[PDB]
Design a protein around this ligand. Sequence first.
Ligand SMILES: FC(F)(F)c1ccc(OC2CCNCC2)cc1
Ligand SMILES: FC(F)(F)c1ccc(OC2CCNCC2)cc1
Ligand SMILES: FC(F)(F)c1ccc(OC2CCNCC2)cc1
Ligand SMILES: FC(F)(F)c1ccc(OC2CCNCC2)cc1
Ligand SMILES: *[C@@H]1O[C@H](CO)[C@@H](O)[C@H](O)[C@H]1NC(C)=O
Ligand SMILES: *[C@@H]1O[C@H](CO)[C@@H](O)[C@H](O)[C@H]1NC(C)=O
Ligand SMILES: *[C@@H]1O[C@H](CO)[C@@H](O)[C@H](O)[C@H]1NC(C)=O
Lengths: 205, 201, 203, 200, 202
Amino acid sequence: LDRADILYNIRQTSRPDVIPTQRDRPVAVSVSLKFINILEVNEITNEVDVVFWQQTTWSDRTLAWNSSHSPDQVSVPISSLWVPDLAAYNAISKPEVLTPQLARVVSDGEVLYMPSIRQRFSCDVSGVDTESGATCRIKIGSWTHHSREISVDPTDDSEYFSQYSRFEILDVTQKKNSVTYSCCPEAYEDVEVSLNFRKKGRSEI
Amino acid sequence: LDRADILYNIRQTSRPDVIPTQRDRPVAVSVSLKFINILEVNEITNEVDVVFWQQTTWSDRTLAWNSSHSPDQVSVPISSLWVPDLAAYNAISKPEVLTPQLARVVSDGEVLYMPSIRQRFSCDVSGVDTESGATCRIKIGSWTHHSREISVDPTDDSEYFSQYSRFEILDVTQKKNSVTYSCCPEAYEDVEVSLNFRKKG
Amino acid sequence: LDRADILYNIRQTSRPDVIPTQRDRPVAVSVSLKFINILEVNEITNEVDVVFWQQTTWSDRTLAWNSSHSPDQVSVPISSLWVPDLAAYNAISKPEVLTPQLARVVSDGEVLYMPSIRQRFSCDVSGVDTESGATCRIKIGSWTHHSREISVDPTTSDDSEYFSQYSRFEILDVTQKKNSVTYSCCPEAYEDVEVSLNFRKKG
Amino acid sequence: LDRADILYNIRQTSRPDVIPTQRDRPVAVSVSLKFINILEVNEITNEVDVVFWQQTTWSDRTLAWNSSHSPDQVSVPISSLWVPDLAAYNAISKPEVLTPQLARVVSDGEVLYMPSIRQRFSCDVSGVDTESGATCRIKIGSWTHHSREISVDPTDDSEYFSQYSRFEILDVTQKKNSVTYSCCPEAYEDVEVSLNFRKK
Amino acid sequence: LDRADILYNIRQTSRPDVIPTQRDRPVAVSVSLKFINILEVNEITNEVDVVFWQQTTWSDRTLAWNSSHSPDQVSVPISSLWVPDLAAYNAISKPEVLTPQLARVVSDGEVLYMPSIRQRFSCDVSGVDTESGATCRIKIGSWTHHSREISVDPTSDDSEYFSQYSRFEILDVTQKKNSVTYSCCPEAYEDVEVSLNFRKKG
Ligand SMILES: FC(F)(F)c1ccc(OC2CCNCC2)cc1
Ligand SMILES: FC(F)(F)c1ccc(OC2CCNCC2)cc1
Ligand SMILES: FC(F)(F)c1ccc(OC2CCNCC2)cc1
Ligand SMILES: FC(F)(F)c1ccc(OC2CCNCC2)cc1
Ligand SMILES: *[C@@H]1O[C@H](CO)[C@@H](O)[C@H](O)[C@H]1NC(C)=O
Ligand SMILES: *[C@@H]1O[C@H](CO)[C@@H](O)[C@H](O)[C@H]1NC(C)=O
Ligand SMILES: *[C@@H]1O[C@H](CO)[C@@H](O)[C@H](O)[C@H]1NC(C)=O
């Protein structure tokens, strides 16, 4: 197969509305945020404006092809794929996608989607101007798929962080959690990302 | 049936433009706001910028399937479903939907749609910096379907509200009302949501 | 007929690009603004930010059905209908439509479309802080259809009936009058409704 | 023919990606800006926010019909027409179109497209608070078509300016410019609009 | 062939989702920024708002036609073409495209795409108010195609198209080839690093 044949097959049999569950087991979605910049912090309102790469991986076996004498991977527009309906539960702006909306599909059906996102959050900005810094927690999970349909798992903290930010990263921790909504008995899995950061140049003058 | 068959059937037959009235009774729509954040308040202009989850449920029997050896629920893009034409009558900004535009459909045709919305309102902000706080009333009902076509029913306070807001919720009440427009004799049902909130000390 | 049949017929025979003229008479479009809020006023720049319901009615006989044992009215997405190409000639922002983009269609082909719009205008804000107030004129007409294709008419109810009690401003008077403009370029006249909003800052 | 038949024919045989050149002559595009408002001026940054009607006309003979017992003109959505790929070379914001995106098509194939646009420009704002005023020059041309494919020609310009603006128009001049760049052998046309305005 | 036939052929067959690799060589993409304006600079936050022409060229032989008694070039909407998935790795805003989204296609399959973009960047603004000025580095490369699929190469006066009305002036522009690696994957991504040396006029 060549790239043209693989992309044709995906475009033609793309069920983007259909979650690719295998034998009624959940789709395992891995999520890791790589922080690139912290642009605005407001200690009065407890709001932060951040740029991050949202590394997202899952399997969709309906995409798979025989890689013998074929590409091992192709770039696919996400409009041609099912993508997990992830939301940041404490976002106060829509995610602004800064990058081309293409995912990488591996011949075994693994999908890697990593948009660069600018987004504003409600989180704890207290201590940003101190040595120990602020800890802003961001919670990401499926909006509509509970734990029997989607599982969410986490996958240098400053490796891609801008050296030119007014802020610096002290630590990033990413832990699995579970939330319940009042309407409904099912739990939703989430990743809770704790961004420990502080303002550069905190000497009193 | 599997998910692929159910979603195919819904996409092919759901009639998103067709209100799913049964035997000329109104469609019963339930609406409840869960307040998540209060972002900006202006006591001079009487404007508030709020984030809320708009829990919306109704029945559409045209979506129903036999759940024997089948999923009991599916996630469906709202572009493939009829959705009630709800509007906040005192909104001064378009609703900004922060979440994926998917609804949950149950095999009996019950639909659950709960977008996270950021929206600005004209309401009473007087007393926000006092112990008793401000009471901002938000009115939500059908833009085009009167009470013979859509009924709106409300059916805890602070449960999902951000601990990091500058504001705190003292009380939320959600009560059924009716409005009439000058053009037309028919009443439109609404839910009136009273948000009692104050600036934290 | 049921709602499903009527909406199917409209969706299938919808010519949304085709003005529904009858026997080469103009389409009579009625426009009435119901002011809901005055949000920002700048007396230096002569700019106002207003929210209004734009009550818009016209006839499209291609939509009509026999109402015997049928609904008298249905809700239709405006993407399935011809709608008049109305513009506010002194708007300085795009109209922000706050409401679901549905119209009501009556079995005789009458259409009622009433979006809630937030929009900014260039108009006379002088006198806003006085007892007699400011008079801001908003002109709304067809962008491309002259008077032989579209006529715009005010309708024949309290000016403040839907106006927010929480606005910093109050309405003293609203008048809505028919106006015609003829440009040097072109022989044809373009109709508008001129809406005069007399308002002031509350004491 | 009636309006329904003409609009059907246009929608069905619309090649909106195909420039309507006749016998390898350029498409003659006329552009005139009618200034409506000057909203924000910054003399420090040399930026202005303006509202104008962009009167745009050209011929597309593929649209033409016999006007005997037929309308002389119809309103057509611009998504059903070829439109010139005009850009304002000194714009610093996307054009905000304030009006319905319809053009008028005449039975001889003339197209009249006149959007109301709000747009921000980088131009000379120096002297805005003086008697002689500022002169802000706006250059509009085809982004991808050289002079053998599109010619741009100027066609009152101040007549419909808002009496309520903080600013007033002293003069508008609109001239043709033809530019050959070092990169490329072909000439590109533009219209250069000089807006002489001042604070009242 | 006339323009209508060429544009019909491209619209029917161009495969915009398909990278036009020849015999498993990478697609050679040339990228050069022409700076038009510097609109806002913040020395505290190290942010700049810039307008530039992103001159972008590559070959797609699936677009080619016989130019005998035919146009040598046509204008094509980029929705009908494969375009490289270029991103500015240090952008902090979406690219605002100010121009019609059309490319020029030459009869040999060369594509020339040059959008005018307004975009905000995180870069070194230190020294902007000094004689030596600031040097702001912008890195542009493929978001999803590594060096075996896309190669990036740089291709007049640095101020030739720069606005005389900017508060800033350009001292120098240099454009060099580099490579980046991401943690997920062993493969390198080629980029152009554009160094904009500029200062405040006043
Ligand atoms: F002011 C008010 F709340 F009492 C009110 C709200 C809405 C309203 O009419 C709407 C009914 C749905 N379609 C048209 C507008 C009348 C009064
Ligand atoms: F300025 C002018 F005289 F050149 C001019 C102005 C307007 C015009 O047509 C208007 C009437 C139809 N709706 C908006 C444009 C033609 C010429
Ligand atoms: F600089 C350049 F070589 F990249 C370049 C410059 C100008 C140019 O054409 C102009 C006229 C047509 N619209 C774009 C600018 C093309 C390339
Ligand atoms: F920071 C940096 F410049 F060193 C850098 C930039 C980009 C990068 O990886 C991207 C390559 C294409 N896929 C998305 C990530 C790694 C480092
Ligand atoms: C993949 O292709 C190879 C080589 O042609 C062959 O061994 C095999 O049939 C294929 N594998 C599967 C699982 O279909
Ligand atoms: C539903 O499923 C069961 C199991 O096959 C079937 O026997 C029954 O008739 C069905 N009933 C309805 C009403 O769908
Ligand atoms: C292109 O067409 C011309 C004229 O019809 C013909 O002479 C020639 O063989 C063609 N050229 C190529 C390289 O195919």
